[PDB]
Structure formats: C-alpha cells, structure tokens
Write a protein that binds this DNA or RNA. Sequence first.
RNA 1: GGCAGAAGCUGCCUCUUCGGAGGCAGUUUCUGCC
Length: 177
Amino acid sequence: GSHMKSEISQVFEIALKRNLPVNFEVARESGPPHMKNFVTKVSVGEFVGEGEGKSKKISKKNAAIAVLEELKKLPPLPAVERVKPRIKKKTKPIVKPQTSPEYGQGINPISRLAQIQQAKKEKEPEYTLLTERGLPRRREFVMQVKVGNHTAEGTGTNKKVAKRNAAENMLEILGFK
RNA sequence: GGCAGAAGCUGCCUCUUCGGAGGCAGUUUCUGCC
C-alpha cells in the first residue's frame, strides 16, 4: 500500500508546527475575481504544488501530494520547538465506520436537503441564529432555517454543527417527506 | 481540463459565570457548479 483515504489531512495540521505548510492559493490573477477560483495551487516549506496530477481523473488531492514530499526534507527546525515521547502513551483509531459496493442520493436528511437545493438552481437554505438563552445553569446553540414559507430548528456546538440536528425537520416542514 | 456545498472520516483554535459554550478548515463519498 502507498496511499490513504486522505493525504491533504496530513499537510493540513503540520502547518501548526511548521508555520509555512497549508498555504493553498489561486493559480491565476487575470480571471479568478470574476465569480470562481477555477484553478488552485499550494506552497509548503521551500516547495510548491498544483491540482493537475496525471489528469485529475485520478484524485482531488494531487496538489498536496505534490508538496507532501517536501515535508520529508524539512530542517531540524531551530524555531517552533516540539517533543516526541514514547513508552508512556498509547492510542487507536475508530473501527465503527464501514463501506459499500453501492451509493445513493439520500443517505441522510442532511445531505439530502442540501442536495435538493442545487436541483432547484439554488445553493443552500436561508440559515439563521437565535440563541435567546443563557441561564446560570443552562446554555445551548439554537439554529433557525427558512426555505420559502416555512422554518426548522436544531442544536449543536458551533454554526457548522447545529445545521446537522435541524435537517431531520427540514424535509417535513415543506413536504419533501 | 476545473470548483463550491452537504454529510462520513481527520484534526486543529478560543472562551467557562463550572451549566457548559463559541470558532475554523481539510479530505473523501453524493450532488451541483466551472
């Protein structure tokens, strides 16, 4: 074996200890301001990479793989100090996840609702925040969303997670379920 | 040739009145968009 499920996920947090990786940026300066980036590049340490790969019909992380080879040629680092202890801690990844020989367009309410908006020539719903609460012994997120004439609500730990809990209602409020 | 959104996986950042909260991105599988 020579690859994993993610490879940009390696580059992405080494930036915390190297202060030069994860510098993803545009590849042009005479068109991207119009509406969309339409090509991307990355710089890491003393090197640089681009999304092209062999043809991009291979992966969507050729940009990072082309610069992750420089993370193997790094200095001793005379700045941003670190440690590497052993025989004192142990860890293991999760084993609950699974795979399938097939896929679908409605695996969960959350993806399903987001996927339906694009088929209507939209992008996303009209999400909103309420959080009209703050008791001496109770605090929580309270999301609101609108889709035309109706609304749903949900709970979470940030504005990228309360979207999950509300989506179970988002199909039943407007009659998609 | 090429990008953005959602979920699953990965991990980071800050606050706490001691209930707990607030904030991010990446990838990959679906979709749409270039």
